[PDB]
Design a protein around this ligand. Sequence first.
Ligand SMILES: O=c1ccn([C@@H]2O[C@H](COP(=O)(O)O)[C@@H](O)[C@H]2O)c(=O)[nH]1
Length: 133
Amino acid sequence: EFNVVPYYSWFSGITQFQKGKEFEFVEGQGVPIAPGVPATEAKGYWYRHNRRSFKTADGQLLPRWYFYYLGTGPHAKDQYGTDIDGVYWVASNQADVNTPADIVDRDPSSDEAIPTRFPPGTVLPQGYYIEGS
Ligand SMILES: O=c1ccn([C@@H]2O[C@H](COP(=O)(O)O)[C@@H](O)[C@H]2O)c(=O)[nH]1
């Protein structure tokens, strides 16, 4: 969870379950599907939420990534493709990444997160679980 209110993503998260696996997509892939969104607007980044667990006396809570359209979210001002720790840029080959996507953020009690799904052919990152699936 968050102790500081996050920017809300339009989509469900993708959660790491195998340690040592890299979060990645093939260039041109990795933008989740949202009805009626034109491919020219399918551009943005996945953002890593590092999660932390509390200490017990038993015996670890791997990261979860969330998608933000280009020009929105916690890295709204950063340039597409720029190395940034915790940021993984993705865009349809139809998209011009010099321009912010035309999509206002999600207002979380006028609209719920869309379950994250990729088009046929999308190479899925092994070691990661798409929430909702
Ligand atoms: O940093 C964020 C941004 C949004 N999500 C929202 O959480 C819900 C699902 O999270 P998940 O467990 O499927 O990752 C969706 O509404 C998603 O947009 C968060 O709660 N944390």
